[PDB]
Structure formats: structure tokens, C-alpha cells
CSV table of C-alpha atoms in Angstrom, one decimal:
chain,number,residue,atom,x,y,z
A,1,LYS,CA,0.0,0.0,0.0
A,2,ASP,CA,2.7,2.5,1.0
A,3,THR,CA,4.9,1.8,-2.0
A,4,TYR,CA,2.7,0.9,-5.0
A,5,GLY,CA,-0.7,1.7,-3.6
A,6,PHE,CA,-2.3,-1.7,-3.9
A,7,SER,CA,-3.3,-4.5,-1.5
A,8,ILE,CA,-1.8,-8.0,-2.1
A,9,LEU,CA,-4.4,-9.3,0.4
A,10,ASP,CA,-7.2,-7.7,-1.6
A,11,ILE,CA,-5.8,-9.2,-4.9
A,12,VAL,CA,-5.5,-12.7,-3.3
A,13,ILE,CA,-9.0,-12.5,-1.9
A,14,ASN,CA,-10.9,-11.0,-4.8
A,15,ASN,CA,-8.7,-11.7,-7.9
A,16,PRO,CA,-9.6,-8.5,-9.7
A,17,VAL,CA,-9.5,-8.5,-13.4
A,18,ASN,CA,-8.4,-4.8,-13.5
A,19,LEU,CA,-6.6,-2.8,-10.8
A,20,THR,CA,-6.4,1.0,-11.1
A,21,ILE,CA,-3.7,2.7,-9.0
A,22,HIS,CA,-4.5,6.4,-8.6
A,23,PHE,CA,-1.8,9.1,-8.2
A,24,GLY,CA,-3.8,11.8,-6.5
A,25,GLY,CA,-2.4,13.7,-3.6
A,26,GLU,CA,1.0,13.5,-2.1
A,27,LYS,CA,0.6,9.8,-1.4
A,28,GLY,CA,-0.4,9.3,-5.0
A,29,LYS,CA,2.6,11.2,-6.2
A,30,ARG,CA,5.0,9.1,-4.1
A,31,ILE,CA,3.4,6.0,-5.4
A,32,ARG,CA,3.7,7.3,-9.0
A,33,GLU,CA,7.4,8.0,-8.4
A,34,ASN,CA,7.8,4.5,-7.1
A,35,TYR,CA,6.2,3.2,-10.3
A,36,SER,CA,8.3,5.4,-12.5
A,37,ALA,CA,11.5,4.3,-10.8
A,38,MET,CA,10.8,0.7,-11.8
A,39,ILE,CA,13.3,-0.2,-14.5
A,40,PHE,CA,14.4,-3.3,-16.4
A,41,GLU,CA,18.2,-3.2,-16.7
A,42,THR,CA,20.1,-5.6,-19.0
A,43,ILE,CA,23.7,-5.8,-20.1
A,44,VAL,CA,23.3,-7.1,-23.7
A,45,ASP,CA,26.5,-7.2,-25.8
A,46,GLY,CA,28.3,-5.4,-23.1
A,47,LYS,CA,25.9,-2.4,-23.1
A,48,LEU,CA,23.6,-1.7,-20.2
A,49,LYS,CA,20.2,-1.0,-21.7
A,50,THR,CA,17.7,0.4,-19.2
A,51,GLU,CA,14.1,-0.2,-20.4
A,52,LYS,CA,11.4,1.4,-18.3
A,53,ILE,CA,8.5,-0.7,-16.9
A,54,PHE,CA,5.3,1.3,-17.1
A,55,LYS,CA,6.4,3.6,-19.9
A,56,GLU,CA,2.9,5.1,-19.8
A,57,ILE,CA,3.5,6.5,-16.3
A,58,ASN,CA,4.9,10.1,-16.3
A,59,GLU,CA,4.6,13.2,-14.2
A,60,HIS,CA,1.2,13.9,-15.7
A,61,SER,CA,-0.2,10.3,-15.3
A,62,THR,CA,-3.2,10.5,-12.9
A,63,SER,CA,-3.7,6.7,-12.9
A,64,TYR,CA,-2.3,3.4,-14.0
A,65,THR,CA,-4.3,0.2,-14.6
A,66,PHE,CA,-3.1,-3.4,-14.3
A,67,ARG,CA,-5.1,-5.5,-16.8
A,68,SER,CA,-5.7,-9.2,-16.8
A,69,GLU,CA,-7.8,-11.5,-19.0
A,70,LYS,CA,-9.5,-13.4,-16.2
A,71,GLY,CA,-7.7,-12.3,-13.0
B,1,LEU,CA,-18.0,25.3,-5.2
B,2,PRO,CA,-20.1,28.0,-6.8
B,3,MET,CA,-19.2,31.1,-4.8
B,4,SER,CA,-20.6,34.6,-5.1
B,5,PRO,CA,-18.4,37.7,-5.0
B,6,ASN,CA,-21.2,39.5,-3.2
B,7,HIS,CA,-22.6,38.4,0.2
B,8,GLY,CA,-25.5,40.7,1.0
B,9,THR,CA,-24.5,43.4,-1.4
B,10,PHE,CA,-27.8,43.3,-3.3
B,11,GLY,CA,-30.2,42.0,-0.7
B,12,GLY,CA,-33.7,40.6,-1.1
B,13,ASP,CA,-32.3,37.2,-1.9
B,14,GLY,CA,-33.3,35.1,1.1
B,15,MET,CA,-30.4,33.2,2.5
B,16,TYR,CA,-28.4,33.1,-0.8
B,17,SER,CA,-25.6,35.2,0.6
B,18,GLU,CA,-25.5,33.1,3.8
B,19,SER,CA,-25.2,29.9,1.7
B,20,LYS,CA,-22.4,31.3,-0.5
B,21,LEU,CA,-20.5,32.9,2.3
B,22,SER,CA,-20.7,29.9,4.5
B,23,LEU,CA,-19.4,27.8,1.6
B,24,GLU,CA,-16.0,29.5,2.2
B,25,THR,CA,-15.5,27.6,5.5
B,26,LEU,CA,-14.5,24.5,3.4
B,27,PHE,CA,-11.1,26.1,2.7
B,28,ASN,CA,-10.3,25.9,6.4
B,29,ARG,CA,-12.2,22.6,7.0
B,30,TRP,CA,-10.0,21.0,4.3
B,31,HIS,CA,-6.9,21.6,6.4
B,32,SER,CA,-8.5,21.1,9.8
B,33,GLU,CA,-10.4,17.8,9.2
B,34,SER,CA,-9.7,14.4,7.9
B,35,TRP,CA,-11.3,14.6,4.5
B,36,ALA,CA,-8.5,16.3,2.6
B,37,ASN,CA,-7.4,13.2,0.7
B,38,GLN,CA,-10.9,12.4,-0.5
B,39,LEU,CA,-12.0,15.9,-1.6
B,40,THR,CA,-10.2,19.0,-2.8
B,41,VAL,CA,-11.9,22.4,-2.5
B,42,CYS,CA,-12.0,24.7,-5.5
B,43,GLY,CA,-14.1,27.8,-4.8
B,44,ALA,CA,-15.0,29.4,-8.1
B,45,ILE,CA,-16.2,33.0,-7.4
B,46,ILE,CA,-18.6,33.4,-10.3
B,47,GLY,CA,-18.9,36.8,-11.8
B,48,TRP,CA,-21.7,38.6,-13.6
């Protein structure tokens, strides 16, 4: 909850198909920064590529949505 | 919040001025109560 603004207990209990994290208020901004800091780093051919997970999320993103087909 | 610039300037409007003027307490209530994270207050003082 504090880092990414979601409840693993709630996800286990309800198996939501979609989960919308909202980035409103200071808490939402901190969660958004945590989401933006998530990176996928990879040294391929001796070069450290840094892809970004959640490329959608930026400083103007008010929400992100985890999607699933069934849960 | 639809706010009026005038609170009793014209008169003869019942409690309109009272409603609009008391609507400005929400600015202080937002800081002083525990509903700041669920609602934000935007008082728009509507002109003529």
C-alpha cells in the first residue's frame, strides 16, 4: 500500500481483473514516483540497456491500470 | 464550489448570501479535518 498503492491481500481475496492505482495527492505522487523508478536493466552485448517498466507513467499520469484477461 | 463575490450586497435574496459565504468555510475545513485526501476544495467565485 505505501509503495505501490495496492493490496496484495485484496488481490489474493478477490482476484480483480483490473486494478487501477490512482496518483492523486502527495501519497499518489509518491506511489507514482515508485512506479516510475521501476526499470528493467540488461547488459546485452556489453551495453547496459535500461528499459522502463510502465512507460505510460509520467509526471502527468493520474492513474495506471493493471489489466488481466481473467484475474 | 459556486461562490458569489457578493454576500448581501444586493439583498432581497433570502439566504443566498448566507449559503455562498458559509461555503468558504470549506477552505479551512479541508486543512482542519480528515477529508482532505478524498475531496479538494475549488471555490469558483462566479462573476456577472
